[PDB]
Symmetry: C3
Subunit: 114 residues, 3 copies
């Protein structure tokens, strides 16, 4: 799986250990080994949410499977909770797009997962 | 909806108010209230279009609904016009990918829209 | 087509010719003229892959057609080869998401390709 967060919060507000915390919590949440989890945090972005540039985040979670109605509600609580606690971003200023990828459409190490 | 523009134009060339204009014009175009529109502008990128590093932009518009053949033509005329007039990017150096998101796959405010 | 690479490798380690090399190699691989290939390289990113911060890349390739099981397996070899040789990234620290775009969902030059 791959989790990306884009935010206007400054880099200095991203706590040391945040990427590891995302890696471990997503491993627990998705049930996938942490070795398959990639995380990407992009601070200091020029963004607006609802026309306001108060702290916000635009995120995506891509996974081969483990995406679905109930699971995505659970991921959203987890991820909004982390963004609120660690980056001080209000959950109503977070969007997370979820993507269930077909294995044939995910390349890794000179092949795909199909 | 979420609109992202990545461009090699420098940050100082992005006019004051551009994120507000995008918010307002996309609210009008999509018919969604501006409170639901998020915008993300990423200048100073290392990009090429057709092998040329002249000004260009790579964009995406994600929305729950309001995506389709005729609508996307209209969005493209609007957005290429704005990138040309505001950022001085030729419309034939712009790509915009459009994504119709299922509500179950969009997280917000500790939940999803499903 | 559009190819995006996000990486934690520093900007100074990205060769000046890399976007042009990607453009030409992707034109040959996809069979599309280079004028329609766009490339975007984002260095210096805060990322982890499998919980560690050694060089890695998260990439995407979007194309109207020329996407599929066998083609994607081939693209992964090309793109891992380029990222390994030019950016010194191990191929098992590369993910590439592939997207077969509908022409109606790709805007360009004030319209879409539909
Ligand atoms: C960090 C990374 C990239 C995560 C993917 C990965 C790996 C090392 C070994 C394997 C990995 O994912 C694929 C796994 C595998 C491959 C093909 C398949 O059909 C099923 C799998 O579970 C083996 O390191
Ligand atoms: Cl996965
Ligand atoms: Cl592991
Ligand atoms: Cl589910
Ligand atoms: Cl897919
Ligand atoms: Cl929406
Ligand atoms: Cl339509
Ligand atoms: Cl969807
Ligand atoms: Cl294309
Ligand atoms: Cl494209
Ligand atoms: Cl280049
Ligand atoms: Cl194929
Ligand atoms: Cl599509
Ligand atoms: Na996408």
């Amino acid at each position: 799986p791959m989790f990306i967060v884009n935010t206007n919060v400054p880099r200095a507000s991203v706590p040391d250990g945040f990427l590891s915390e995302l890696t471990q919590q997503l491993a627990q949440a998705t049930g996938k080994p942490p070795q398959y989890i990639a995380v990407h945090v992009v601070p200091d972005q020029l963004m607006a949410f609802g026309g306001s540039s108060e702290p916000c985040a635009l995120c995506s979670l891509h996974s081969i499977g483990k995406i679905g109605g109930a699971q995505n509600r659970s991921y959203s609580k987890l991820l909004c909770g982390l963004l609120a606690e660690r980056l001080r971003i209000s959950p109503d200023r977070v969007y997370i797009n979820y993507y269930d990828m077909n294995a044939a459409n995910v390349g890794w190490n000179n092949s795909t997962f199909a």
